[PDB]
Amino acid sequence: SSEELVKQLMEEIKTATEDRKIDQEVLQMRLSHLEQRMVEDLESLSTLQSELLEKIELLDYSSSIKQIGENLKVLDRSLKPVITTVSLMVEKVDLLYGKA
Amino acid sequence: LSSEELVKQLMEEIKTATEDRKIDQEVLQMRLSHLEQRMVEDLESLSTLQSELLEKIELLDYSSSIKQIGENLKVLDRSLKPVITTVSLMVEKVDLLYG
Amino acid sequence: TLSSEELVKQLMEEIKTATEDRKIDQEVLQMRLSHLEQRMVEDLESLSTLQSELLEKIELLDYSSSIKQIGENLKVLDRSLKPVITTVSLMVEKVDLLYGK
Amino acid sequence: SSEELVKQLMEEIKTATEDRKIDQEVLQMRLSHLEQRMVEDLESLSTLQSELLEKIELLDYSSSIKQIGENLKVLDRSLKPVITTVSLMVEKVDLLYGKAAVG
């Protein structure tokens, strides 16, 4: 019963090492689940992030707005000569109208 | 200092250490599950925010307003120098008729 | 030179030093997960903030009205010019006919 | 078969201890893989977000759109007299055209 206490105990360590074997199964099951959920979800986020990027570059109107701006400055330029050419016609027409 | 008493001491040392290791394992299982639940909670939030960025950014669509302005700017261009030039011609033609 | 009783006692001091060291080793594996959770919590918090700060910035970059106005003002300036263009248009038809004779 | 039992038990404990030592090393190894994957993925999201913060600044036309609004108002104000002036002048051309047209 000292030699039967060693008997029982060698069965406990056999028992406990079987338990530990399953305990380590469950652990791998939770680890893998986290790793797989991390790529499903940290990945999913990256898609949308990049889908947003697409639309940000599809709503770049810097070129259209630079151009509108520049076309408006051409008109505003041609105002100078226009007023000049009109003012010379006014006196010309004023002269014919006084000497008709 | 018996043998049957000293095997029993070692029996309870091992029994304890086995109880300890089990707990350690259940602690680790809980911490892994907690981390995964927290990560999911916090990503679902970010994931929602990013969908409302996808919509909200359509506020920055001006494609149509911008085409209409490009065209009205052509209309203005035809409304100025080409008109004056025909007027200057016209005044030239009247001027001769009075000669 | 190995009494059964003496091998047991040696096994108990052995096991005792292994149960202490097993303890420290497990506390480190535990705190590895606490450290990673925190790291993840902090970085996702920062992400979330920027996301909100981006949302506020999109609202500060809506010049949709300010563009519609320029769109309209410009329609108004063009409409303001049709009457004079018509007048010139008619006078030119009349003058060119007389000049061509 | 007292000392030879202890010596057998000791061997069972040795194989149990060393199996555990390895399971710990295997766990430490998956944890390092987890730590490195998590950090690499979070650094990517943080990279891609700060690239987002920059691209969106390209849609800040405020400076341009003020200048457009400004340059238009000028033109619109600067044209009001030019319409008036050409309208009076074209009426006078009319009155001159009438006489030239009968004579």
Numbering used by the authors:
A (entry chain A): 72 to 171
B (entry chain B): 71 to 169
C (entry chain C): 70 to 170
D (entry chain D): 72 to 174
The authors write:
It self-associates in oligomers through a central oligomerisation domain (POD) and bridges the RdRp and the nucleocapsid. Here, we used X-ray diffusion and diffraction experiments to provide a complete structural analysis of BoDV-1 P. We observed that P possesses a modular architecture, consisting of a central oligomerisation domain (POD) surrounded by two disordered regions, similar to other Mononegavirales Ps. Using X-ray diffusion and diffraction experiments, we revealed that BoDV-1 P adopts a long coiled-coil α-helical structure split into two parts by an original β-strand twist motif, which is highly conserved across the members of whole Orthobornavirus genus and may regulate viral replication.
Crystals were obtained for the POD of munia bornavirus 1 (MuBV-1; 77% sequence identity with BoDV-1) and Gaboon viper virus 1 (GaVV-1; 41 and 43% sequence identity with BoDV-1 and MuBV-1, respectively). The structure of MuBV-1 POD was solved by molecular replacement using BoDV-1 POD as a starting model, whereas GaVV-1 POD was obtained de novo using Se-Met derivative crystals. For both MuBV-1 and GaVV-1, the asymmetric units contained a tetrameric POD, whereas the tetramer for BoDV-1 could be obtained after applying the inherent symmetry operations of the tetragonal space group. MuBV-1 and GaVV-1 breaks were also composed of three residues, with a strictly conserved aspartate in the middle. The Ramachandran analysis showed that all of them fall into the β-area, with neighbouring residues at intermediate positions; this confirms that this specificity is conserved in all Orthobornavirus P. Using the Vc determination on the diffusion data, the MW were estimated between 40 and 45 kDa, 12–16% lower than the theoretical values, all corresponding to tetramers. The three X-ray structures fit perfectly with the SAXS data.
